Amino acid sequence: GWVPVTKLGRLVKAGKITTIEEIFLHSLPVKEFQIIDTLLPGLQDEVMNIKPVQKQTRAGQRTRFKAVVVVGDSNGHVGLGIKTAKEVAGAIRAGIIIAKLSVIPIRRGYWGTNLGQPHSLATKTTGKCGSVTVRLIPAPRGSGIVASPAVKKLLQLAGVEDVYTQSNGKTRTLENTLKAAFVAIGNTYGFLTPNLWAEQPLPVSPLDIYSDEASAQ
Amino acid sequence: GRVRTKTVKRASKALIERYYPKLTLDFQTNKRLCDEIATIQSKRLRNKIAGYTTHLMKRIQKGPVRGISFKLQEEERERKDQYVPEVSALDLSRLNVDNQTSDLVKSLGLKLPLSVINVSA
Amino acid sequence: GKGKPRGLNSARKLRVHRRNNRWAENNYKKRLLGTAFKSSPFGGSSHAKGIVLEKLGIESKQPNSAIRKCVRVQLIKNGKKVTAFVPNDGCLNFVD
Amino acid sequence: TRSSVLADALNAINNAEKTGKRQVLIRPSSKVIIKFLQVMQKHGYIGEFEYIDDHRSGKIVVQLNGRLNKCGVISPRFNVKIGDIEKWTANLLPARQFGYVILTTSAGIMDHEEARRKHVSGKILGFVY
Amino acid sequence: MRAKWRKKRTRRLKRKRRKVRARSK
Amino acid sequence: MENDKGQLVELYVPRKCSATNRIIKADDHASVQINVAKVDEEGRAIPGEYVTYALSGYVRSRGESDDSLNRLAQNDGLLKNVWSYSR
Amino acid sequence: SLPATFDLTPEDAQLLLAANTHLGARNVQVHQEPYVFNARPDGVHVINVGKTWEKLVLAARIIAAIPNPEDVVAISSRTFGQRAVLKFAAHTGATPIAGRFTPGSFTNYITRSFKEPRLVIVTDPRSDAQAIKEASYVNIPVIALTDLDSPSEFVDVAIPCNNRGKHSIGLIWYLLAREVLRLRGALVDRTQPWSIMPDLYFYRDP
Amino acid sequence: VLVQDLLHPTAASEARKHKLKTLVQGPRSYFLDVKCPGCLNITTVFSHAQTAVTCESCSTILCTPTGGKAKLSEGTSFRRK
Amino acid sequence: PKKRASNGRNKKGRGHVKPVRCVNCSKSIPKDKAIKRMAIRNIVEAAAVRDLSEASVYPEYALPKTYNKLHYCVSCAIHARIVRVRSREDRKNRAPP
RNA sequence: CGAAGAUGAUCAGAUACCGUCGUAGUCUUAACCAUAAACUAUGCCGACUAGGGAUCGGGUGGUGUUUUUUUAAUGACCCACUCGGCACCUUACGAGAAAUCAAAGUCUUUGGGUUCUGGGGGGAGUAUGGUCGCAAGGCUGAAACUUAAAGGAAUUGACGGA
C-alpha cells in the first residue's frame, strides 16, 4: 500500500514475483526498497560505525554524520550501503534503505566432502576497495568466522559459518574494508566452478511474461 | 528591473496548461477570472500573474512557447506534420550508382537500374 | 620477474641478499651487534640496583606542565649514571 | 629473453580468456606446451587446439570456450615430493573439489589427482582452474 | 636550511675537523 | 551444487553470457537479455515465443556485443550473411 | 527462419540506393568493417545494404517481441531523426523521446520523464550517448542507427546506415516501423508496399 | 573481434602482413628469367638481388642493387619464377 | 606531484638541446621550453600610414614589416600576460586559442 | 660575459637584487676530477593485452598527380600496407592511496629471466677505518642519543605585493 512506481516493484506488491532469486537470475535493478522488505521479511540490520566527517567552510565546521549499515538474513543475502547525512536518524534509517537495494546473494559451498548443508564458501575470492584487500578462504567445519569483528559481522549476517580471512592495506579504514569484503562475498557467484559448466535454457524475465499486470497505464 | 519571479512564471505556466480554452489576450478578464480559478492571496500578486499569462498568450499566437504543452497545440502541430511531399523523393527522377556501387548491387544479385560515372581523383 | 631471482640454483644469492637486507630491522641490528651489553646502562638486564645520588625534579614536556620527581642513580654493577622516575603521588619522600 | 615458452603459452591464454575471446594463438609450441594443453583439454578447460607445423618451432591456435579462470606457470619447476602436493594445491587452487595442479613426472606430464593415484611425483609446471 | 646550504656549511666543517687532526699529528 | 543426499542446494543457478560464457550476476546491470520473436509463415510475431540471448556487461562495454549477436543469431538462422568467420 | 520473402526486395533497394544510405564514413571503426564493402576513391565507403536489411529485420524481430508496444522507447536528439522518431512513435506503440533526453530518465525514478523501456532505439550513438550510457544501468538492450564511425559500446544491435543525409536517417526509421507492423496484426501482408510514404519521415525546412 | 579464424585468414589479409608475422613465415621475393636485348640467353635474377648481375653477352649489368627490389636494366624482358 | 606530462617543455628524446636568452630579462632558458612568439608588425603604425602615404615618393610603395622571434622566460611571459595560467583541465589544450 | 673584488643608488640597516667596471673563469692544448633535479625522479631483456590519426627513416604496390607535349624517365607529393623510433590523442578492460598510467596492465586468481636499492623521521652521507685524487673532495660508511610522528596524493576552506 505504498503506490509502487518502477514496474518490477509493481509485480512485487502484486505477489507475482515471490522470490528474490528470480530478481538475481535476470539481474534486475531493485530501485524500491519495499521489494526487499516483502521478499526477505526475516531481515536484520546492524548499525556499526557512525563516523562524523567534517567540511571546512569560511567559518566553523559542519560535521555531517556517515553510517555503515549491514542488513542481512543468515540464509545467504546481505547488503551494504553508506549514508552521509546531516543527522544520525537520517544516517541510520536511510542507511538501511541503501543497504537493502544492494542485496546480493552468496554462493556458499564446501571445504568439503559434500555432506549436507553448505557451511562455508566454495572458492577463494578477493575484493579490493582502496588499499584494503580481503581474501576469504573456504574452511572446514567448526572453524567459525576467523575474521576481524567488522568482517565477521558481515559474514555472520550472510550465513557463512566457517571461513578464513587474509587482509592487506589499511584494515583500520572501516568503510573500504567492508566494501572490499562486500566485493569478496559478491564474487562468490561470479566464479565459474565446474558444476556451473552445464548449459542452461536462458529463461524469460517476469517483466516479459507478466507484462500486463506490470506497466500500469 | 522588470524580470518576473519563478512563482509568477510557474503559476502563469500552470494556468496555460489547464485553462487555454478560457482566458484570452486581454489582461482585464485574465485578472478577473484568476479570482475564481486560482486562490491568490494578494491583489498585487494576482496582477503580475495575470499579466505574464497575458504575455504568454500573445507569444502563443505566433508559434508555440516551450515549457508549455497542451492538446490544442498538440493535434495542431501534428496536423502540420502529416504533410507528404509529392516531389517523388526516394523515387527515380529518370539513380546515380558508382563503379563500386554497381559491384555491390551485382553482388546482391538484385535487379536495379544504374548509371555508371567515374569518380574524379 | 619482480626483482629477486627465482631460479633453482639461486639459493645463495637469495640468502646473501636476505642477510644484507636483514640489518635494516631495529631488533636484528641491535641483537647481533650486541648493543644491549656494550651500550645501554642496564647491560642487557631487566632490573639493576644502583645508589641514589640526588633527587631531581624534571620539568615535564610541553604541552604538559608539571615537575616529574625523578632521582639520579649510579649503578652498583656498572658505575653508569642514570635518571630514574619515582612513580606515584608522593614517593620522593620515600627514597632518600 | 624468452626463457619459459610455457609461460609464453599460458600468458597468451589468460590474456585472451579475460577478454572473452574464443581463441588464442600460442607461439612457440613445446611438447610441454602440448602436454599441458592436452591435460587442460581432457578435463574440460579448452576446446580443440590445433598445432601449426611451420618448419621452425610451431604455432598453436587453441579454441578457448569459456570454462577457464586461471592457467599459469610455477617457475622454477620446483622439486615436489609426494607429501607436499597437498601443500602445493592448497596454495594455487581455490577449493579442493575442483582445479588441477599440473606436474612433470617421469610417468608423464600430468595433473595432481591421478598422480596421487599413480603414487608418482616430480616437478611442478603449473595449475588450471 | 636548504639542504644544499647546510651542505656547504658541513663541507666547511669537514675541512676543519680534518685540520684539527693534522694539527695534532 | 548438490549435497550428499541428492538435494541440489544453492541459494540459484546464474545465467550465462551467450557470447563469452561468463556468469551474469546479480549486480551486472550493464548485462542485457534479448528476446527475439520466432516468426511463422509469411511473417508474423508468434507472441510469447522468443530466440533468447544474454550478454554480460563486459562484452557490451568492450563494443563487441554487436558482432557477438551477429554470430549468435546467424547460427540460430536469424541472420544469413552478415558475419564471416574468417576475419 | 526468414523464408524467402524477407529478402531485400529490389523495390526496397531503390529506396536504399537513392536515399544515400549506402555511403558510409571516411573513418571505419574496427567494430564495423563487417559492414564495409569496397572503399571508393575520395575515401567513400560503401555499406552493404543487404546486411543493413538483415540487421533491420532482426531489429524488428526484437521490437515485435515486447508484448506491450509502448515500452519500446525511441530516441533522437538530432533533428534529422526527430520527425522520423515521432512517425515511428505514432504507427507503433513506441514511447518517443525527440530532442534532448533529460538525464535521470531510466534511473532516477522520481523524475517526470521516468521510463523503463524494455528496448531503446537511438539514431546516433554519438549524440544519444546519455541515453545509451544510462541504458547500461537498468539492463536495457539498445538498437542503434550506426554509421561506420560510431561507437558500438553498449550497442547490442547496430543497423549500418548513413547518418549524414536526412533521407538516409528517415528511410531506416520508416522501414523499422514497417517490419514491426508487418510482423504483427497491424500491416498483415508482407508483399504490398506501405501506402504511408517514405518522405513523411523526412526532415523539412522551414 | 572476439571470434575469428586464425587458421584460415583472408588471403588479402595475408598479403597485408609482414613476411614474418604471417601464420607460416616465408619469402615475398621471387626469381626472374631475364633476357638481355643483345641476345636470347636466360639468366635467373633474385628480386632483391644485391649484385650487378652480368650475362654472357651484355656483360655490364642486368639489374642494379637498391635498398629493396633490384631495378632491372630498362631493356631487359623478365618473367616471374 | 607531476603537474604536466610534458614536464614544462618539449623534450622527449634529447636530454639537452641548447639554451636561449629571454628577450626581457636575459634568463638562460632551454629553447624547447622557453616561450616563443612571432611578432610581425608593420614598420610605422596603423595610425600613421596615411601621413607617411601622402608624404612619400613612390605611390603605394610597400609599407614594410618588422619581424622578430621573441623568446620569453616563464616568469616574464606570465607577467607580460602572454600565457595566462589556465585551469587543470584547460591547460591540456595545445591550440593557440 | 663574469664567483671574487672595486664602485653608484635605495632600504631603518644591505656584507643583496639594479647600473658601470672587473681578476679567476668562460675558449683551447696536455694531463686530473667523477659529480648533476646526471630526470622519463619510471633498470635491462622477453611475451601478451585497445582503437585512432600525424611525423621520421626503410621497403612494397598504384597503368595517382608532378614534367597533361602521341601509347607523359628520375626526384617531390598523394593513397594503402607493413618494419623500427620519438611522441601524442581517446577510452579505461586492468592498475593504484590518488595525481595518473596501454604501462605504472597481464598482481592474495600473488612465480617469464635478471641486476641494484629501501625498511619511521633525525643524528648523517656525520664520525671512524680503508680506499681514490695534486687538492677541492669522490667511493664505502656507522653507532650512541633523540623523536610520535615525518611524509605522499587528493578534498574543502583560508590567504596570495597571482
Ligand SMILES: [Mg+2]
Ligand atoms: Mg636479484
Ligand SMILES: [Mg+2]
Ligand atoms: Mg607544486
Ligand SMILES: [Mg+2]
Ligand atoms: Mg640531462
Ligand SMILES: [Mg+2]
Ligand atoms: Mg670548462
Ligand SMILES: [Mg+2]
Ligand atoms: Mg648521485
Ligand SMILES: [Mg+2]
Ligand atoms: Mg635517480
Ligand SMILES: [Mg+2]
Ligand atoms: Mg639505465
Ligand SMILES: [Mg+2]
Ligand atoms: Mg610503429
Ligand SMILES: [Mg+2]
Ligand atoms: Mg630509518
Ligand SMILES: [Mg+2]
Ligand atoms: Mg656513501
Ligand SMILES: [Mg+2]
Ligand atoms: Mg673520510
Ligand SMILES: [Zn+2]
Ligand atoms: Zn645476355
